[PDB]
């Protein structure tokens, strides 16, 4: 068998993507039923980015100032309101291809698929993780604002991320679909910096279980460790603390492989103190921390969607 970074199958979302143009500024919107959701900075010009007073600028806009295009079909805007950092444009036709959907706010360490779009058209899909410092490591050019991240469960799409901005260190920041920013960021071209990032230990343990399941077992030692001693070592290498809840979440993988969690912890501790000595795991020379336990179970058990 095999192990690859896998994105959810798309299509349900692509039928929802539109172009929104306000004067010279253009970005992407999400068309669900008779409402289009888009970033509110679309109503700003290039000078406005320094210190935009959004209330003043939005009071001066009428319905006709918004040009919304779904491929060839122009949609008439008949109302608009602002919720936090997102605009909501009421349009006069409901989207016939609207899927079953939910809005969710994810926790750091969780993963999702991103559909990168430009000028209302999709360019590609890829998976990313929410880093402990509330950034993501994506791939986004000018024009990509309004692209969304999502998860699928059977038939229900959970939208969790709308893209807004790029930071100095080449990381990316955005909001949930209710318009609240992830992390301490603001939609302004000001000095902002990502904080110290940490490594998601539970994801590394999931990846080592994936490796064991795929037959890469050279790193298994014969020792065990205590939780407190492990976290003493982990803290020195800028790893997050392992909690008892995390230990319980790894239970199914442990049962599947017959390897207790604390043995994997001892093996990770040895990898951390001694390196990989030129060896690779799953084709990688670095430890990978962007697979949740659910991702591993899904890929190794082959869960499908209607």
């Amino acid at each position: 068998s095999g192990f690859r970074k896998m994105a959810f199958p798309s299509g349900k979302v692509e039928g929802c993507m539109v172009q929104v143009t306000c004067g010279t500024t253009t970005l992407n919107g999400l068309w669900l039923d008779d409402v289009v959701y888009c970033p509110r900075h679309v109503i700003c010009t290039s000078e406005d980015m320094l210190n935009p007073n959004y209330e003043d600028l939005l009071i001066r806009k009428s319905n006709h100032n918004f040009l919304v295009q779904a491929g060839n079909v122009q949609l008439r805007v008949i109302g608009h309101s602002m919720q936090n950092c997102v605009l909501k444009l009421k349009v006069d036709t409901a989207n016939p291809k609207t899927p079953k959907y939910k809005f969710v706010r994810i926790q750091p360490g969780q993963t999702f698929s991103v559909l990168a779009c430009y000028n209302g058209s999709p360019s590609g899909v890829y998976q990313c993780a929410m880093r402990p410092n509330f950034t993501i490591k994506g791939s986004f050019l000018n024009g990509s604002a309004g692209s969304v991240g999502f998860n699928i469960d059977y038939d229900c799409v959970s939208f969790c991320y709308m893209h807004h901005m790029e930071l100095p260190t080449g990381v990316h920041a955005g909001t949930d679909l209710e318009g609240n920013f992830y992390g301490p960021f603001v939609d302004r071209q000001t000095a902002q910096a990502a904080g110290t990032d940490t490594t998601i230990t539970v994801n590394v343990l999931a990846w080592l279980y994936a490796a064991v399941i795929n037959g890469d077992r050279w790193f298994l030692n014969r020792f065990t460790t205590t939780l407190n001693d492990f976290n003493l070592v982990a803290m020195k290498y800028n790893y997050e603390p392992l909690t008892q809840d995390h230990v319980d979440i790894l239970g199914p993988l442990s049962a599947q492989t017959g390897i207790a969690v604390l043995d994997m912890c001892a093996s990770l501790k040895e990898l951390l103190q001694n390196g990989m000595n030129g060896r690779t795991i799953l084709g990688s020379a670095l430890l990978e921390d962007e697979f949740t336990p659910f991702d591993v179970v899904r890929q190794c058990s082959g869960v499908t969607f209607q």
């Binding site: 253009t26 970005l27 986004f140 000018n142 990509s144 071209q189 902002q192």
Partner: peptide, 10 residues
């Protein structure tokens, strides 16, 4: 280093 808001152009 200032942030770049990644909106496009018409």
């Amino acid at each position: 280093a200032t942030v770049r808001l990644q909106a496009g152009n018409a």
